[model samples]
Target chain A: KPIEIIGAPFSKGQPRGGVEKGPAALRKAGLVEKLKETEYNVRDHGDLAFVDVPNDSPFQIVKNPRSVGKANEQLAAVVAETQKNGTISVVLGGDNSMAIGSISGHARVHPDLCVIWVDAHTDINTPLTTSSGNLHGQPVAFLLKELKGKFPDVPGFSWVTPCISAKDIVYIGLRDVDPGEHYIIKTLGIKYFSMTEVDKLGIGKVMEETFSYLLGRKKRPIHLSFDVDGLDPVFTPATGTPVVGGLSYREGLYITEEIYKTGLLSGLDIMEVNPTLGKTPEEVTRTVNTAVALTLSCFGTKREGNHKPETDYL
Target chain B: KPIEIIGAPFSKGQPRGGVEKGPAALRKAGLVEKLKETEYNVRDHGDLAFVDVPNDSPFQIVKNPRSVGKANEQLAAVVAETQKNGTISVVLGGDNSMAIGSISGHARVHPDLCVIWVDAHTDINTPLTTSSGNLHGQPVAFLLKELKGKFPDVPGFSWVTPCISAKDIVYIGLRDVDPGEHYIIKTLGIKYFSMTEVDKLGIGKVMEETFSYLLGRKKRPIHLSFDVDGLDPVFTPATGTPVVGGLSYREGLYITEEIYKTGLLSGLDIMEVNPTLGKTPEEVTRTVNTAVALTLSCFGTKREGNHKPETDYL
Candidate 1:
């Protein structure tokens, strides 16, 4: 299938310098070439112009809420446009908050779209419930419009009608969920696989269970929202919030590989690769390359094949 | 053996911006803790302040030659001081050019010191032969007092007496050598293991041969000068001049592991980790972590021991 590239390069929604540089970093890391190697017809939309809404009267409960909403609104338009063409749109993210645009865009086109949100945190805090007040943590709650009555409205997000039902989205690799996020996941009966479950059932089985639960033998289009922190800090130390004992590099790749095998991947968001946060150039390269590699895997790049199996058993 | 870390955070030797950040990046990556985990007594001597000399008619052939000479003279003094204390000195680099200090310092302490220069580029350009006018590309040439007659004198390097003999130094991972460097290596009959040789003999055999050729059945104090660019760009994409094919991450680590087993390791230089060049935060993290992991391996970190070997014997 053909894939359209969408870049969201703004990080005012997060407390960091280089999350704004993620889109540039990924592009420089050869994101297009990787997809081309997989023979996927790739269309590059470059990046969105980052609008820095002055934080003069920023939302008290959700910091930078207006900017996040404003950016995602533009992102939704791009993603929705890409989806209308029936092309799989892969969004390169400044942060995980990009899920607001990606999921909403995919949902707008296909109301029955399912989301496979792979992240270390559930990121489900609403404005009133968030402790950090960082909008990057509350993208999921904002997208789930069914919970609109429970949350206060921000200025810029008025145009965004709820597109995703909590039931359609499944969470994986969650280990550091906030108390509010945890309560929402439990109360809403959201299907989620924590690191503990990943450890117990293994990534393969967890993936199988997630697919079965979400699809139930139907081949529904899937939007895979991947946060780099879903992998261990050792593999992705450049991210803002690094949780230890998350997915191994191999496990993270395997999850993407499995998703590709489902042949239902409609869109992807590879998020939160902040280049400036890395203490060294190497660390930044490692995180960026991993993000690029993960996206390539989603579009179908494999380690095996190409070379014949060693048939000469000496 | 105890390891003492000496930081040379001067990047004026090169044209790049962030090679100066290598020392801070290594420390932030927990270079000391990585060694401590491997059961080594590691002491850190923070970072040297980088001074940029006012260009009062700077040397024409070499840009910033005076500052390069000055920083390295200070670096050599620290390295020599560290050696006098009888502890193995591990010099964290601002760039590969720091070797002028590290190698000279070690050689001053032990006249019979054997240097293992591991890098993709030979870094053997003399002031007259260098095309880039970057001092970093010419550190080895300046340090080789035999070639001193061939090079013009820089302002601050008058105190540097030639300490290393051409025969005592060996090169590994040499694939990106300049014409002058290649000619010098061949004319001097310098022992070098290029990537072609590594591809044929394997890193294990390559190390064995390098040790055998240098020591000739004797155990001598060795100085390992490792430029992060020695590894392939795939493993070290954040480096200044990364070549296409070089050492794999495991092969690079294995070389260090084998060298540590010799017990005659007196000094090591982990050089050329520029954090600013990486395209993303993750890439920077990967390169830095790999550099740290490589250093830890030199201090005796292994992948085995905690887990039991598979015992399903057929």
Candidate 2:
């Protein structure tokens, strides 16, 4: 079966120099060909563009609303048209706010899909609620169906529509958060597991309940919004936003691995790996290698070992 | 952690001379020590006795009536004492009639136990319904609770109690049954799967329904009464009675394999492997080795690959 591969090359959603190289970095790591040995008929659609980014004259305190919003809208348009029934899609990205368009685009086709949002922050900060004005930290604010009319519209994001409810998305690996972000999560009664949940219940139990929460009522298509910074900084020192006490390598593996087990994983967003951030070559390669393993695992790569189904020996 | 191994060394129950060597045959095949490597703290109780056998004195049409009855009484006494609640006990048998004592003995400790009787013949013929004069053909007659008062007491068997109801036992691998045996099955509303069921539903499906039938009402202890002749004659030519179109090797392995999975399997009897009957040494070893493998499987041998839970790489 073929897997759809699309790239989001805009890094304006977050403050970073080479997060835009996320797609090409993975390509250079030979991830596509490695995935090939698994015999997947993968189709790569090169890189999607960030056209006509209107320089800020910002909206209140939010930075690059016009630039990030315009790029994400283009993202949604490509993904909306790219989605084929039942096959998984890989959305490599410049920033996690790439989810703003990625989820919006996929939601049009699979409207009942749930999101497994793995990140270190809520990404739920409103224009008035922000500690920083970055759009990467504010994608969740623009995407929630439950929080409709909770915030005023940004100038460039007027074309965006909220595609997910508080219950439709579950936040995992949350350690960095603004007070108002936590306040919004509480007031909206969203289902989330902060690092405290990880510490107390262990990652295995957390996913057990993560699955039970999002899949409790009905089975729906799943979108995995995986931010590289959600992993321990040891694994992702090359990402823009490095949060302490993030998920362990094994925990990151188990999260994506179990999602693949469910077969409901329809779309995935892996964002914010900047090779320029790492001081040493070893550091950047460590970050890219770990990210590539996690991505391959989502499509049935194994650490337990496996063999292809049909083979002949001479 | 221990498995109790007791030998039923008397072969007077059938018209065979060398079947009595069943215990020594398996021992020479290194079954017990091989089983020991699997860390079953196996306690071999050597062979039980056949003292004070009354010769010739057939009961109507039944041969060795008093002889078979007395030795089986010793079998019940040993097994009734040897059953250690949770661990499985292995009963090595000289003839299919060994079940008369094996089932009776286990029932004393686990009266609620259900029997999975795998054999080529019903062994259910009564004293009045016999096509042959062998007591091996009449064991099911004595073990069943529903058939009580249906037969005149053979002089020495008054000590035996009918422990299983028709519902508590389900017959599989049945191809050679008497006309009266078929009539008894119908009139009594017994559950049985003949060779036809094996051909139609397959052994896997048959086992699915077998588990449902035996455990459908409640989860109880299980006893597997397996006859080597239940397998096709090609696999078990050394047995006293070799029936055609019996279970294949995989089918035989699957039967014993799945029974071990329940962990409810409390006792097993492997009857009728006669090495003396084989015309060649290869034929004898094949019968002995296959029987040994099946016995090992009942105690958790595998056809699928597996590794012990704890290990050292160095």
Candidate 3:
């Protein structure tokens, strides 16, 4: 299958920092060559222009709400075009907020889309719930409830109707849940497998159960929201929020590989990676190495098989 | 021996861009944790703060020269202190330009310091020869010139004399050579090796030759300017510049491991990693993993007990 690697080089969401250069960093990391080396026919549609933006944000301390909307709309068009061409859409991100457009666009055409969110943060906050006022944290809520009464003014998302039900979304690696986000999860009864759950039930079993639950007798499509912070800081140090406790390298690979095994993944969202944040260039290089390895796993590349990883293992 | 990690979060010799955040990003990546994990007595005296930056940039077009100087001065002080204490200083960078301060501090203690520069860019542009006005792109030149007579005015780098002779610096994996830099290299008649040399001559031979040539008779301490970009983008994608056809993971490792084997390495600079540029959080994570692995290699990590590496291995 053809793969469209679209770059959302935006940082409008969440503090207007750490994401503007996401595409450039990943491209530098060799996503294109490595994927090709793995035998996948991949094409990268570079970062789209940000034009359509909201006049003003409804919330009290919105940083770049308009910019976020504009960026997402551009992403939506790219996702739409990729789907029309019958290609697998791998939406490389500037932040979690980019998913509002990526997932919505994919869901609009294929409404039966399931989402597997591997992250430390639930990212289920609305304007009323957010404390930091970073829109990057609001994408999942806005995306799942696109055009729904809760997110009526989600700017460019006004056209997208809520597609995936709460039951269809399975969250993994959540440990740093904001109280408001926690409330929303409980109130909506969102299906999440937190770090505790992963510890009790191994990552492999959890992934197996997640795939089974999402597919539940229905041939539905799936999307993956992989926040780099979902992994332990030792593993993914370049992420904006470095949550101490999270998944291991092996667990991260197993999750992506299992998702690939399902063969239901139609789109993806990988977000919040900022390499230069920690004053250590090694941190940036190391985290990016791990992230790209996981991307290979998403596309049927296995480490233990005849195909060996072609670069340095961090 | 204690490992001294000096956070040189200096970005002044360049633009007002966020390069200063490089140290913060690396710290967030948990540099201290990694060293401690390896049973090293690591002392991380958090980021060294520069004097109050000028409200206005000193340069007409080139940005942040004063800011860079102030940061470097602070860096030089910390580095000097580390040397006085006889601790091995590992300088974490905000940009490659900080090499000016780092080398000066090492030179303060050991006048005969030999530099091993592993990078994609030579960073040898003098003020008269610079084109982009990006200070991070020009440290090697400024560090080599004994006097700053050719440049505009800046603060805090007055005492930084060119201590290492041009013949003492060994440049490796250098593909992106600037025009002026090339001229300087020719004028200075410096010893250098590019990836081409590594391909034909091999890493083992390259290192053996490098150490033997530089260390010739005098047992001068070595300072490694380890730019993550020196390695193939497949491993170090979060680097500032992505140059193809660079060192393989094992070849890169072998170089570092060989240097470690020498035990002549005293001070080091892990420079030019920017994680925000990676295409995805996953890619960023992988880059960090790659960098950490490279660092481990320098700290005596090996595979198969001296087995020669092939392309199939990372």
Candidate 4:
């Protein structure tokens, strides 16, 4: 399968700075070469130019609402084109807000596409319920046409007709969800595997149940939106919001590995890796290295006996 | 061995942006854990917050002169403290300008310490001779007492007394030298091994001659200042000034290994890793990954027997 690596170096969706550096950081971590080393043909569709939030645009409760809409609109086109060409798009995120574009673009083709949202927070906040005013908290709301009626009037997102229904998407590794998001998840009857379920069922069972529940008899294209914060802070400490008792590094990579095993994986988003939030270099290294490792895992590295053995010089 | 990682997340020394992100990028690439895994006691001093270039400073030929001086003054204090603690300071840099602090701090203890400057360009341009006005290009001039009288008045560097003589420092990987810098190198009779010599003698012999010429069979505490740009763009594309035909990744690592083997390395600076300059994600990964690898090698990670074995089940 052909793979396209697209970068969204944006951060206007959130208040914290440096999430815009994510795509650059990920690319610097050797995502391309690792994919190529797997004997897969990879095409790098370099980053979308960072768009500054428009100052004159009408504002709602969300910060940089217009910039978020505009950037995602651009991202949607790229994702759409990649899918149209039957290429698997690996979207390197500026923030989770880019998901609006990735899912929208993927859905434009596979209208019944299944979403695997791996994040600490549910990210299901509608414009009305987001108290933090960060649009990164509400990308899923905009992508679901069912909830559009609840959102306050916002410019630039009119082009975004709902692509995926609330029923098609599943969330994993949620621990720090906002009350509004919790309400939305329960009210919609969306299948979600929280960290509680991860602990009880084990990562393997949780993943098996996730796929079985969403696409029981079908092998629909899957869009895996992976937030670095889904992993424990020990594994991913450099994100904007970090919650303890999250997935372990091995569990996180295992999630990607299982998803890749499905062979139905069409797109991936490695999100919310903020390099500047780290207090120490080790913290940054820990997060970035894991992010890279997790990303490579999703792309089917070592699924075969491909890793070269070191010489027995000793 | 105790390794103290001190970060200088500064970029005002040069005009091309993103060098301030170098320390975080390196740390994020796993420099700390790699050292710890090698069984070295590593203390992370974290990063010095990037200070802005002071506008109140009198105009000089050097760009951000006061900010560079002030930051390095602070950096010198930290480096001095680390040395006083009998720890090897691994300074993660913002740019080559960081050398002012690394060399000054190292020399305060050893007094007669030798410097192994691995850079493509000779950063010996005095403030008066600097055509680009980037202070990052002139750290060596300010550190040398012989050139101090020739400097224009800069406010914050008053504390920087000449710490090392020109004869004490040797340059490796010099391929791009400005006319004035070439004049100073010759006039001072400094020992420098350019790429021509690297091609002729190979990395091992070049390093052998470097140590022999600098210490003459005696082992002295050495400060190794490594600019990532010293490596070819194929290895480090994210630096501000990338000169082609520079050291290969293996050759660079070999230099660090040779230096570490001598047991004379007291201080080290891994410089010029700019996360923003890379046009592709792979470029950033290549540069940052090589940097982390090089730093680990300096701290004594064996070139062989370093990787963990994969599972036999695969």
Q: Which ten residues in a row are the worst by lDDT in model 3 chain A? A: A305-314
The per-model DockQ list reads 0.02, 0.01, 0.01, 0.01
Write the residue-wise lDDT of candidate 4 on B1-314 in tens digits.
58899999888778877988888888888888778887578999999875666474546656676788889988998899989989999888888888898889888977978889999887888877678878888889988866768766676788888988877888888867866777677767788887656654568889989888988956688999999888888788998898755788888989988987888889999899999889999989988999888888887777784554563543
- Candidate 3 - CAPRI tier? incorrect
Residues A163-223 of candidate 2 have per-residue lDDT tens digits of 8888898989886775577667777888887765565456888999989998989999999
- In terms of docking quality, how is candidate 4 classified? incorrect
Worst 10 residues of 1 chain A by lDDT: A305-314
Better of 2 and 3 by DockQ: 3
Q: Each prediction's Cα RMSD? A: 14.5, 18.4, 17.6, 18.9
B10-85: candidate 2 lDDT, tens digit per residue:
7887887887898999889998898886746788888887886645588788888887888888888888887844
lDDT of 3: 0.74
Worst 10-residue lDDT window for candidate 4 chain A reads A305-314
Q: Looking at candidate 1, what is the lDDT of residue A210?
A: 92
TM-score of chain A of 4: 0.94
Can you give the lDDT of residue A285 in candidate 3?
81
Q: How would you encode candidate 1's per-residue C-alpha lDDT over A1-314 as one tens digit per residue? A: 68999888878677776788899999998888767766578989889996767853667766777788889888998889989988999888888777888788888888888889999999988888988768888888888856877977887888778878887889999899888888899998899999999888767678879989999957689999999999998788899999998887667777887888889999899889998888899899989988987898787664221111332110
lDDT of 2 at B51: 81
- Error at B23, model 4, angstroms: 39
**lDDT-superior candidate, 2 or 4:** 2
